[PDB]
Design an enzyme around this catalytic site. Sequence first.
Site, short mmCIF file in Angstrom:
data_model
loop_
_atom_site.label_atom_id
_atom_site.label_comp_id
_atom_site.label_asym_id
_atom_site.label_seq_id
_atom_site.Cartn_x
_atom_site.Cartn_y
_atom_site.Cartn_z
CE1 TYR A 119 -12.37 2.40 -4.26
CE2 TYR A 119 -11.00 4.66 -4.61
CZ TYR A 119 -11.38 3.64 -3.77
OH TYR A 119 -11.01 3.41 -2.59
NE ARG B 167 -14.24 -2.06 -3.52
CZ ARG B 167 -13.23 -1.48 -3.08
NH1 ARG B 167 -12.01 -1.38 -3.80
NH2 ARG B 167 -13.53 -0.59 -1.99
CD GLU C 26 -12.03 6.18 -1.40
OE1 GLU C 26 -13.06 5.42 -1.47
OE2 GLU C 26 -10.82 5.69 -1.27
NE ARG D 171 -14.65 3.41 0.86
CZ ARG D 171 -13.66 2.78 0.83
NH1 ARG D 171 -13.11 3.19 -0.69
NH2 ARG D 171 -13.08 1.71 1.05
CG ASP E 120 -1.81 -1.15 1.32
OD1 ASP E 120 -2.30 -1.90 0.09
OD2 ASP E 120 -2.23 -1.76 2.43
C1 LIG Z 1 -7.04 4.65 4.10
C2 LIG Z 1 -8.61 4.76 4.01
C3 LIG Z 1 -8.88 4.63 2.55
C4 LIG Z 1 -10.38 4.76 2.19
C5 LIG Z 1 -11.29 3.92 3.03
O1 LIG Z 1 -8.29 3.43 1.94
C6 LIG Z 1 -8.63 3.26 0.48
C7 LIG Z 1 -9.13 2.21 0.14
C8 LIG Z 1 -9.01 1.41 -1.14
C9 LIG Z 1 -9.94 0.76 -1.61
O2 LIG Z 1 -11.05 0.51 -0.97
O3 LIG Z 1 -9.96 0.19 -2.72
C10 LIG Z 1 -7.95 1.73 -2.02
C11 LIG Z 1 -7.39 3.24 -1.67
N1 LIG Z 1 -6.03 3.45 -2.39
C12 LIG Z 1 -7.40 3.28 -0.33
N2 LIG Z 1 -6.62 4.77 -0.01
C13 LIG Z 1 -5.43 5.07 0.44
C14 LIG Z 1 -5.08 6.62 0.96
O4 LIG Z 1 -4.55 4.04 0.73
#
Ligand SMILES: CCC(CC)O[C@@H]1C=C(C(=O)O)C[C@H](N)[C@H]1NC(C)=O
Lengths: 388, 388, 388, 388
Positions: free
Chosen positions: D325, D290, D196, D211, D70
């Site tokens: 997404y 998803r 987000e 979200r 990550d």
């Molecule tokens: C750190 C929390 C965040 C939102 C829930 O996680 C996301 C989850 C993700 C996801 O649910 O697909 C991928 C994103 N790349 C991630 N964001 C970061 C900055 O790492």
Amino acid sequence: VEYRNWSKPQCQITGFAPFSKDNSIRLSAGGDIWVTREPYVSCDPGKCYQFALGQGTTLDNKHSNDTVHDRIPHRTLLMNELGVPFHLGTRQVCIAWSSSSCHDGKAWLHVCITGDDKNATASFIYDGRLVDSIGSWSQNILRTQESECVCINGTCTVVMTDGSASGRADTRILFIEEGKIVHISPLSGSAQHIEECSCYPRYPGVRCICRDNWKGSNRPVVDINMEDYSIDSSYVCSGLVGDTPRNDDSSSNSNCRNPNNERGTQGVKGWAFDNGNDLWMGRTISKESRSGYETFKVIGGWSTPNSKSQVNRQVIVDNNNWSGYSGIFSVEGKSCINRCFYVELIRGRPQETRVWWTSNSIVVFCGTSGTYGTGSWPDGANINFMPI
Amino acid sequence: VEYRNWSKPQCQITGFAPFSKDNSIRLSAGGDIWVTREPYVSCDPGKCYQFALGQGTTLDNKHSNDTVHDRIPHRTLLMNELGVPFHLGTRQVCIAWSSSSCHDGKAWLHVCITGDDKNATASFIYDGRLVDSIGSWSQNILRTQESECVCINGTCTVVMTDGSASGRADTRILFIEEGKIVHISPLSGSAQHIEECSCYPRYPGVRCICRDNWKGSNRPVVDINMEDYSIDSSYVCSGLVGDTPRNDDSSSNSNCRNPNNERGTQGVKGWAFDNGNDLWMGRTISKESRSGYETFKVIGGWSTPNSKSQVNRQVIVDNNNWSGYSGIFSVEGKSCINRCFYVELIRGRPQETRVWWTSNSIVVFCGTSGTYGTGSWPDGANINFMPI
Amino acid sequence: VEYRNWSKPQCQITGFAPFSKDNSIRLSAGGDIWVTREPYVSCDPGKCYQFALGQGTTLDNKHSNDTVHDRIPHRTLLMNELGVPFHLGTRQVCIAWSSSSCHDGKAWLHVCITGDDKNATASFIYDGRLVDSIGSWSQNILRTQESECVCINGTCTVVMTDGSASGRADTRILFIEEGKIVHISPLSGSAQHIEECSCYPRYPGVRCICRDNWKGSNRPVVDINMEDYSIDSSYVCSGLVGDTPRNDDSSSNSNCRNPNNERGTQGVKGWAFDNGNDLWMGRTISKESRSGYETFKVIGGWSTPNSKSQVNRQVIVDNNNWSGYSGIFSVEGKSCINRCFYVELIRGRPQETRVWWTSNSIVVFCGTSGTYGTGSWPDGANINFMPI
Amino acid sequence: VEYRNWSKPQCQITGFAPFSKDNSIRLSAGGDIWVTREPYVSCDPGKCYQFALGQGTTLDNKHSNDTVHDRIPHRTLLMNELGVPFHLGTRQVCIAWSSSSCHDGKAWLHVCITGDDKNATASFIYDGRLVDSIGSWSQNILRTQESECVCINGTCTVVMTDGSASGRADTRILFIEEGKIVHISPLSGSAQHIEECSCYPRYPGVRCICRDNWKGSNRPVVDINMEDYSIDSSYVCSGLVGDTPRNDDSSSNSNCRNPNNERGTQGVKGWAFDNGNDLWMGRTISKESRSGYETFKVIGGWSTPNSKSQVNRQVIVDNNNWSGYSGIFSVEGKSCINRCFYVELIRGRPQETRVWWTSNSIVVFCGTSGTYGTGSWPDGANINFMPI
Ligand SMILES: CCC(CC)O[C@@H]1C=C(C(=O)O)C[C@H](N)[C@H]1NC(C)=O
Ligand SMILES: *[C@@H]1O[C@H](CO)[C@@H](O[C@@H]2O[C@H](CO)[C@@H](O[C@@H]3O[C@H](CO)[C@@H](O)[C@H](O[C@H]4O[C@H](CO)[C@@H](O)[C@H](O)[C@@H]4O[C@H]4O[C@H](CO)[C@@H](O)[C@H](O)[C@@H]4O[C@H]4O[C@H](CO)[C@@H](O)[C@H](O)[C@@H]4O)[C@@H]3O)[C@H](O)[C@H]2NC(C)=O)[C@H](O)[C@H]1NC(C)=O
Ligand SMILES: *[C@@H]1O[C@H](CO)[C@@H](O[C@@H]2O[C@H](CO)[C@@H](O[C@@H]3O[C@H](CO)[C@@H](O)[C@H](O[C@H]4O[C@H](CO)[C@@H](O)[C@H](O)[C@@H]4O[C@H]4O[C@H](CO)[C@@H](O)[C@H](O)[C@@H]4O[C@H]4O[C@H](CO)[C@@H](O)[C@H](O)[C@@H]4O)[C@@H]3O)[C@H](O)[C@H]2NC(C)=O)[C@H](O)[C@H]1NC(C)=O
Ligand SMILES: *[C@@H]1O[C@H](CO)[C@@H](O[C@@H]2O[C@H](CO)[C@@H](O[C@@H]3O[C@H](CO)[C@@H](O)[C@H](O[C@H]4O[C@H](CO)[C@@H](O)[C@H](O)[C@@H]4O[C@H]4O[C@H](CO)[C@@H](O)[C@H](O)[C@@H]4O)[C@@H]3O)[C@H](O)[C@H]2NC(C)=O)[C@H](O)[C@H]1NC(C)=O
Ligand SMILES: *[C@@H]1O[C@H](CO)[C@@H](O[C@@H]2O[C@H](CO)[C@@H](O[C@@H]3O[C@H](CO)[C@@H](O)[C@H](O[C@H]4O[C@H](CO)[C@@H](O)[C@H](O)[C@@H]4O[C@H]4O[C@H](CO)[C@@H](O)[C@H](O)[C@@H]4O)[C@@H]3O)[C@H](O)[C@H]2NC(C)=O)[C@H](O)[C@H]1NC(C)=O
Ligand SMILES: *[C@@H]1O[C@H](CO)[C@@H](O[C@@H]2O[C@H](CO)[C@@H](O)[C@H](O)[C@H]2NC(C)=O)[C@H](O)[C@H]1NC(C)=O
Ligand SMILES: *[C@@H]1O[C@H](CO)[C@@H](O[C@@H]2O[C@H](CO)[C@@H](O)[C@H](O)[C@H]2NC(C)=O)[C@H](O)[C@H]1NC(C)=O
Ligand SMILES: *[C@@H]1O[C@H](CO)[C@@H](O[C@@H]2O[C@H](CO)[C@@H](O)[C@H](O)[C@H]2NC(C)=O)[C@H](O)[C@H]1NC(C)=O
Ligand SMILES: *[C@@H]1O[C@H](CO)[C@@H](O[C@@H]2O[C@H](CO)[C@@H](O)[C@H](O)[C@H]2NC(C)=O)[C@H](O)[C@H]1NC(C)=O
Ligand SMILES: CCC(CC)O[C@@H]1C=C(C(=O)O)C[C@H](N)[C@H]1NC(C)=O
Ligand SMILES: CCC(CC)O[C@@H]1C=C(C(=O)O)C[C@H](N)[C@H]1NC(C)=O
Ligand SMILES: CCC(CC)O[C@@H]1C=C(C(=O)O)C[C@H](N)[C@H]1NC(C)=O
Ligand SMILES: [Ca+2]
Ligand SMILES: [Ca+2]
Ligand SMILES: [Ca+2]
Ligand SMILES: [Ca+2]
């Protein structure tokens, strides 16, 4: 920037001179190049662009076998400057398994059709934004020109069909202003089947030479009145007919009014244009296969039914090489409007079964008032050198 | 934008400084790069471009063996900003197995020759559209400069030849305004054979130094009067002759008027320019082969027959490395017109038979009024590392 | 367009924020990417560009083993928008094994040095044309900054050296107007050896922090008066010295005037800049190897000899990863001039012997008046995944 | 150029028409294409751009297995014209593992977050230069929208969160003028968890649909007052909830004020927008995974709590295909502001374990006032054809 009016006389041509070739398939054997078909050319006021429908894949790619399927959702309209092959930096302009594009003097219009066969969507994109859309009206492969649309004074016209490819269908002519549909006119006149129109400005109107896929090997003509939206249609007079398949020259006929019922079913996209009573036209050299390409002038080919006197023949692609679709585009010169054409050079399936894919390259010629010689400009790839 | 007149004095140079190198062959061993030959350089008023004739294929590609054939229909004129190698995003400007290009201050003119040996077509493309064409007048490989044409006040001139490469031919000088041929003058004067002219503006006229492929190892000169279209021709006076093959320096001759009949048959494209009575020139280092490249000033090389005193020699490519064609281009500065040159660095056949292909890279130098050192800038590829 | 004057105060920074990273080496394992070293960054009034010296080859290419040789004729200056990796469409701006570039507000100047070690040529290219050149003055590797030059009111200045890399050499400061050398000033002051200056505008003059390759691990300072062409020089006051190799912080010294004679021989290109009495600087984390990278402010680092109080340290590259050259560039904001820097991340030889090549990627940080956290931004390639 | 105000009424739409598709994964099997996730679309006043977070590698590259980690320091924001796939010529705009971008009518702002999880840095880059930065305020993955920010009259707003992804966090709304943070407002109102945000101009303010990763499968709403910087928040009224996971339609609830505590933990980035009392929204077809993507209008979906009457459903991606997404972007037309959306089509891990990597392609649709049909536009790659 001002709207194009195309209000100059047509250039007085003696034949055609070489303009562009992209060598797509040859390059595909040593580089990452898009799988395409249904190419065309259209120019903004400054320079020309090549377009084609991608298959969502490069040629040297296992996904290249996807061309066996019709109208996949991954097909997109590709656009590059003319002569820039479809490399990986090519912009996909819209989602499309059928398209038409044109520049009105200010901005590009793209007409892009995608989705289900029985329920397709045409998107109208102008100046980089989606302005309008229309759904299928006959629930049977909504489809369009596969060559440039034509705009006069800010109104662009495009010919679309929905319905049978082997019987009566529902053809409509759309009038589009800055991406917005402002009027739709049904086909009128004596043309009985219309596919893949090759249209050109003939101020104050637009003239299209199309493909009858049902009963004619003579090409239908659609005349579009830009002032009052009225439509007329007929068939090219020339007894030397433009479609493939077709009869031999000695037994081919056209009466200017009806499909000739001579090997009429099926066809290929092509073009022709009038100059007074005469006709300039291209066609495949083979009467039954998409092989070779030739252009010539038919004396009285526009005005005299069944006229068969030709002159000024040029071989573009010899009959030992594959051709494909062809279409017209128009280019504004200093004092006249010139006519040019492109030829799709199809390689792979169904003709060449060593490979699983189908793709094409292009060659492009433009009208000339000068002189010229002879040659042949085929795709040039060795099928045995290609990735399968 | 205004038309170029080139009405500034010639820069007073002391020699040449390194300007550009594209490393095409080295890159071809690790990337998709076009197979080319006959490169040249031409600049618009802001920046320089490199041109070459493609062979319709990349190097690491089985189609690269096509270079064994002469004048294939797949040859196209490639155009990139100078220093951008011919990668797959390169624009193919026209179909051409012989070409010339120039910018008149407003737009690019390209002269593109293709088609059958006995019946070729020259297309004239200006400001992105086909404006004119001419057919072969002697039915024997219509052909042109393979370097930049020259435009003064909106009239561009280009030298073309049709006929024997080993005997008297038919050379004509064309005058072109916005892509339209306005006048054609036959060659006149004492030059007996003209090929591949390297031309430059010498206000109010144009001067060309060419290749005599028949009887001379001294280079012909063509003088073009842009005011009345009159033509004159002769030979470079210098006893240090510019062609390859040639006699050694102790036994080479020129009388300024006639071909010297010294190893006269065959040759190579090259260049020279006058500065008062003196001559700046380049040539291969080898007298027999296209190996090495050197430049120098010949004292009295323009005005004095058989002059052999040289000064300001520079090695561009040492004699252990392959060269090829070379040509001049001119660049407008603040107060003077500078002269620059490119050298084609040919790799592969016929000299290197490990591979089947023939291609080239380039190195480019520009006139300087400053100071400089020494070096050698060859192609640099290891033939053993190359795809065959 | 107007000439740059850089006549705004320096931005009051609290440290540096991440700006750009190109991931060159990671990408080289799955794509055609240039082999490079000696990168830098320079911006025109609108946007930033990355530069580097190519090795005439891509990484996944047998020619990549050429990096074992010094100063090959195939090295060329590459230029792309910042963040566009050096792919095959990258323009080679000039032939160079040492370079400097800068934009004067109107056009780019490139200083490009190539040719024989004992007799090199520096070419000066402005607004896309060769304007001047100078030959070697000490016959021993004429060489320049490997980072951006600086222009004020249309006069650009660049620091050049010729002579020994391990003893007294001949350093000169050139003043260039639209590509033309208008004045050359010899180095003056107490700096005893000058290499690879990192220069920045400090209106009305220019300040450079350089590399002493002879007797100092403290970095020399060169001050350039743009009004009268006078030169002064000294050493950075900070007792926390900027060169590599260097002594431990507990035993390092600088007196602001002389080389410290502490592991003085050899070095690495780096940077620092003043803010009042204080100094912002970067250096490798390792004292003897080009490993890691850190920035910090030294309280009294500009004005107090041997000052060792640091604050605002940031790790840019942790000490488990390779660094390399670093240099400054300046960016004009709305009300202030900001200072930024790049770090060269060298991979391959001599440190990593699995592969035969040497190349680099870059990371770029810019001054900020805001806040920030921590991180480490190394090259990130797995040496075991690379072509050898 | 003037600042965008977005002061036109919202276009009255009947649904959405196909706009763009990039085919990234299909192309990755036959070309060098970046590994990405978290894509979005944003347009300048003339044309649209696609953005994504790179993983510092192409797909056919051993480094593609890095996606298991990550927030690697090698993640950079990629930016191309919409429809140009992320090939090797793509510009990396900044270093970022979380981002947002928007154009204020004059220039691009990019918000780029990188560095350590517990101490990240957000960089603010405007008009090609770093203008500001902020450090982590809660020491727990400072993060932002992963879609376009919104600017009105030169003030851009962006929503950022720092803290737990599974409990109460610290969400702040930033106001940015030419890259400079001018004000920061804490979240206010009844939204209990914000991640987000998909934001859009609703003159005179900005509205975001986000979200809730903690307690809600109903989507939070954030209302931003651009005049006084005040913040309000709530939940989308619709009983047809937009998050994944969620309850089935017969057992899902929303009261407009609180998280619904129905499969509330975790989620996916998505979007909705109001039209009077009604709501246009997208969501995955699967309630747990998803997979698939659908859009529809909810009658009373904005104003009536627990409203479940839908109309104008369209399948964007059928439920046999992976989505990901999704987010909104807004496009100014002649007389109205249109709403468009993109859908991320995730391939590879965790759902497809034949490969080690995770990447995505995109499909993009725009609001239409016209008519349309049906289809499905999934990624289209065959996982068995992919490099592992
Ligand atoms: C750190 C929390 C965040 C939102 C829930 O996680 C996301 C989850 C993700 C996801 O649910 O697909 C991928 C994103 N790349 C991630 N964001 C970061 C900055 O790492
Ligand atoms: C650092 O770089 C600088 C800049 O590049 C170097 O300075 C340059 O150095 C050059 C070489 O000295 C110099 O050019 C020379 O100029 C002299 C006149 O001053 C000229 O004679 C030279 O030409 C002869 O020599 C070259 C080899 O260098 C030969 O290739 C050429 O053919 C000439 O040789 C012929 O003539 C000679 C004299 O008559 C004969 O001795 C020789 O045998 C040969 O004779 C044959 O040809 C004759 C016809 O020409 C014929 O009659 C006879 O029968 C034979 O067949 C050369 O042009 C540059 O002027 C100079 N540039 C500047 C700006 O100063 C510098 O050297 C470098 N530094 C170092 C340390 O090397
Ligand atoms: C050619 O293309 C055009 C344009 O695309 C097509 O026209 C479109 O066709 C759409 C489908 O008919 C239509 O949308 C629909 O509008 C109706 C209202 O008129 C709406 O009820 C539909 O939504 C239901 O059906 C879809 C599947 O089609 C479900 O995914 C959705 O969840 C809805 O089903 C639920 O509600 C139904 C009615 O209450 C129930 O019967 C069903 O079981 C289900 O109930 C669950 O959810 C409830 C909450 O909603 C809950 O109470 C209950 O407990 C269950 O859990 C759908 O939105 C478009 O309006 C139409 N567009 C236009 C412009 O006309 C055309 O069909 C195509 N041509 C051909 C020949 O196919
Ligand atoms: C160098 O290049 C130039 C320019 O390209 C060449 O000049 C052109 O040459 C062609 C071929 O002669 C010519 O086009 C012909 O014009 C004739 C009228 O004058 C037409 O009768 C002729 O059509 C017939 O022949 C074709 C094959 O050439 C057939 O494909 C076609 O179906 C026609 O054949 C039918 O009709 C004839 C006559 O009734 C009959 O005998 C047959 O059985 C059949 O029923 C072509 O259209 C161009 O007009 C010339 N162009 C110009 C500008 O002059 C030149 O030939 C080249 N040089 C060399 C040495 O080859
Ligand atoms: C989140 O990020 C922020 C911003 O990056 C972090 O805040 C920064 O933290 C660093 C480290 O503390 C700090 O820089 C230090 O400032 C000190 C002065 O206050 C300096 O003494 C210190 O230098 C010494 O320590 C370094 C290692 O940290 C050594 O590399 C260096 O050589 C120095 O060590 C010598 O000197 C000391 C003191 O004399 C001696 O004990 C040693 O033995 C040795 O001789 C750093 O320069 C920044 O000032 C902070 N920045 C800001 C804006 O506040 C923050 O720490 C991060 N959060 C977390 C939780 O880690
Ligand atoms: C791409 O598709 C073609 C079919 O269009 C595949 O070829 C088939 O392969 C199967 C199994 O190997 C055979 O049974 C069929 O006879 C083949 N059909 C044809 C028409 O040749 C091909 O295998 C696919 N490519 C890949 C890499 O899987
Ligand atoms: C490319 O062309 C060359 C010929 O120009 C081919 O080389 C020939 O190959 C055949 C069969 O292997 C030999 O018998 C000939 O002796 C070869 N000719 C020469 C001149 O070497 C070559 O095979 C072609 N490339 C490919 C991939 O087929
Ligand atoms: C590229 O150059 C390297 C040397 O820099 C070559 O490696 C040498 O190979 C020879 C013969 O195989 C050995 O004897 C040497 O020991 C090697 N030297 C080193 C330093 O490793 C390499 O072979 C070259 N690459 C290619 C493809 O030929
Ligand atoms: C890329 O990373 C993955 C791990 O994320 C590597 O896969 C592992 O390989 C080792 C050794 O072969 C196995 O023991 C593990 O079981 C694998 N892990 C998983 C999760 O599958 C992979 O080898 C790496 N790629 C390369 C080229 O080395
Ligand atoms: C559906 C009828 C139409 C024209 C007759 O078929 C065309 C035949 C084709 C052809 O004859 O080559 C290929 C075209 N891609 C296809 N058009 C569409 C929209 O699928
Ligand atoms: C046809 C005569 C001409 C000049 C002598 O031959 C040239 C020789 C060549 C050469 O000497 O290298 C290669 C050129 N490509 C060729 N030109 C054409 C048009 O084929
Ligand atoms: C010649 C002296 C110079 C600086 C001390 O050596 C540099 C050392 C280098 C280095 O320390 O990494 C690599 C540079 N490419 C080289 N410069 C040149 C022009 O070759
Ligand atoms: Ca038919
Ligand atoms: Ca000769
Ligand atoms: Ca040192
Ligand atoms: Ca949730």
